[PDB]
Design a protein around this ligand. Sequence first.
Ligand SMILES: *[C@@]1(O)O[C@H](CO)[C@@H](O[C@]2(O)O[C@H](CO)[C@@H](O)[C@H](O)[C@H]2NC(C)=O)[C@H](O)[C@H]1NC(C)=O
Ligand SMILES: *[C@]1(O)O[C@H](CO[C@]2(O)O[C@@H](C)[C@@H](O)[C@@H](O)[C@@H]2O)[C@@H](O)[C@H](O)[C@H]1NC(C)=O
Ligand code: NDG
Lengths: 249, 122, 214, 212
Amino acid sequence: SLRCMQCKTNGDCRVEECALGQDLCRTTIVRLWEELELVEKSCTHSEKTNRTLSYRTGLKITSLTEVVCGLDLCNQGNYLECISCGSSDMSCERGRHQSLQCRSPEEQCLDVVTHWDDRHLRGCGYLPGCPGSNGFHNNDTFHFLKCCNTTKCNEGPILELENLPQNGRQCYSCKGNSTHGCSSEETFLIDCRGPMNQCLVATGTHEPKNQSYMVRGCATASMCQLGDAFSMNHIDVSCCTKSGCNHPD
Amino acid sequence: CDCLNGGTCVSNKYFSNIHWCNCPKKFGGQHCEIDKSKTCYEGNGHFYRGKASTDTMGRPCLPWNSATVLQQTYHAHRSDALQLGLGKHNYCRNPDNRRRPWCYVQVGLKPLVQECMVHDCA
Amino acid sequence: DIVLTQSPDITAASLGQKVTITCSASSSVSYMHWYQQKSGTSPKPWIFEISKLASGVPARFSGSGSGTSYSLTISSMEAEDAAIYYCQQWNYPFTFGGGTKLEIKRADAAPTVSIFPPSSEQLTSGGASVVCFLNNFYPKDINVKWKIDGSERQNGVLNSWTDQDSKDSTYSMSSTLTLTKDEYERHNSYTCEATHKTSTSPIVKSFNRNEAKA
Amino acid sequence: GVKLQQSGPEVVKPGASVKISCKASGYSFTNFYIHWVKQRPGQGLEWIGWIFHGSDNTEYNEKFKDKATLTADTSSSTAYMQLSSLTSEDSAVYFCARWGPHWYFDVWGQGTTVTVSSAKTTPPSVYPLAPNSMVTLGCLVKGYFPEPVTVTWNSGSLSSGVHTFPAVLQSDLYTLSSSVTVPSSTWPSETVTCNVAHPASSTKVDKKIAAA
Ligand SMILES: *[C@@]1(O)O[C@H](CO)[C@@H](O[C@]2(O)O[C@H](CO)[C@@H](O)[C@H](O)[C@H]2NC(C)=O)[C@H](O)[C@H]1NC(C)=O
Ligand SMILES: *[C@]1(O)O[C@H](CO[C@]2(O)O[C@@H](C)[C@@H](O)[C@@H](O)[C@@H]2O)[C@@H](O)[C@H](O)[C@H]1NC(C)=O
Ligand SMILES: CC(=O)N[C@@H]1[C@@H](O)[C@H](O)[C@@H](CO)O[C@@H]1O
């Protein structure tokens, strides 16, 4: 019986009756300086968390930040140096990286790779699975997050999947349902690369409603303990370190 | 992608996927709806974007999202607010086809439609 | 299975000479590494990610390549560069090339041949080994033929070679003919015959079991 | 700081098994792959396989799948490799190497020598090799086991003009020789003696080269 403020960016707000499973309220804030501030709110999934991400992409500076809480309408109320760049303006892909000083003793240097919104992002912040780094890749996805807390520890060439060597481990890849997307006739072997040698299976909920979702591929150990990387909500992951042990049993 | 003019859409998987846009130097706002360059208006002014907080006799327009204008016909919260250029600002717009861009101006107790200051590009 | 072929197999380069080793791949590989090994000890990373030099590697070394062909080059051959170089694919099979033995080319040198009879100690032990040293010669190719009373003997012969000498870049070889004390006592003339490019005729050294000391 | 410490040389009987260790130190053991490489006498390098974090995460070279077994003791940051049913083809030097940051084998262990033999520790028999300005001399070190021996001339005084050849296998035992060249005015008027030391049998022998 949780309720949250549901506001669009235009300012139109209204009370929202949370659906089963969404026991948290969220306020997502985006700030674009050169300033413009976007605010959005609604009920959200149980495993969401407070997170920040700031990065400069040339002259601009984008600051994303999401706060969560689990009380009725709690929704209503209002220097570590890192390297920063972005895909929007080919900042990263062009090696035109810049120094950005975090403005929260909790913000670490981040390096996030999202290959089929920005493919490459670097800056300040704190995200789920921060302390350390994690990675995953399958027939059509490559995700990697690096979070560290030492001056410009997120510097260097941008990480591409092609620059990670095949390690020999082979895992099955697929996406969808166990009947549609992840069937014995749809799933196939891929070559795991670099540190990703865990054959993973993630089952949860994607799409609008509670559609059962599933994804299989190669992953780092740190991934076998969230769903934002797989676009899911309640994620249940399973891992094994034997080639093909990933198969729909 | 609901961006306007020369807008490139972007979002973030970690932040509820809230979206916004990359606009040319002369366009501002979450959707590149604001035209910070235009000084004069079109012929009808229907598709005119840009500032013009002032009225024919130097009078401040009301924010299309002010409590007041939210109770008028045209306001920031209508389903078509983005197509009409009605948002959190008080720039002259011509949602209804009137041969001249206007805006709501407060006069005493009630807000009334006043012709805009903006001149014609002719 | 991506096959890596290194070439040349073995080459002698004169000091100051330009050397180029190549590694041919059965299929494309994104990156290739090169390791240097001396005297069978731990291979040392030399050039990684196609052209990056490991800490301490001299500037005369450089590597290049793409897809199916890569090469390590040393602009000016120096003494300490003599070793075995191995290329290796950066990924999964981690296959190493067959290796290239790089040695110092030098002027030809004829071997100094020395033959030695079985010692008193060994003979009283009931055995008999005849030893022959062919030292400090260049190039490495050399043929040693043993003869007992003039007839060639191939069985019972064991050979050993040294690596290029540190000081003079030559090679040395030892050949030992082992036979029973009785067969040794039944024959007189023992000969070590060495064939090297430095001479059209064999360098022959021998002794007679009968003729020696009082 | 960062290194891989391998266990000592092994002499194992054919058919038996052997297990060698590689202790990692100077870095986080569980975050890097450890590869094992084989090198037979006078031959190239062969990849055996790798282990990552623990015994349950390994990958093998098809050719060694039934010969090697890679395990790890995470609590001691040590990787182990077992080789079974050893033949003569297994006599080699085995190295462990870390797959470093830039994906090349960046840190190598010193290597572990594995000699597959049925021989027993045998001391060598040292024999003098006696024949105008220079006179050679060797010394023949026959029938010892296991490797190696240490040959010196005149307790190390004679260093220049010495050639100590690689041992060869003769009757499942080793045979080696060494030559020394000196001015004839030095020998036999003076004494030339080869000193042979075989630690495996705790033996040291001095053989003076007397005129034949
Ligand atoms: C620092 O920012 O990050 C490191 C690691 O990213 C943190 O170190 C760690 O927690 O340090 C512990 C002892 O200091 C150690 O027991 C533990 O194993 C480490 N965890 C990791 C990364 O494996 C460190 O605490 C952070 N502190 C700062 C400077 O923010
Ligand atoms: C996290 O969601 O933050 C809330 C309260 O917000 C903070 O709530 O908001 C920022 C902007 C600062 O004002 C902070 O001082 C403030 O604490 C907090 O109540 C939650 O507990 C926290 N989430 C966690 C840690 O679970
Ligand atoms: C396994 C399951 O949940 N069934 C649905 C199926 O009815 C639907 O047609 C399909 C389309 O995406 O998705 C899922 O496979």
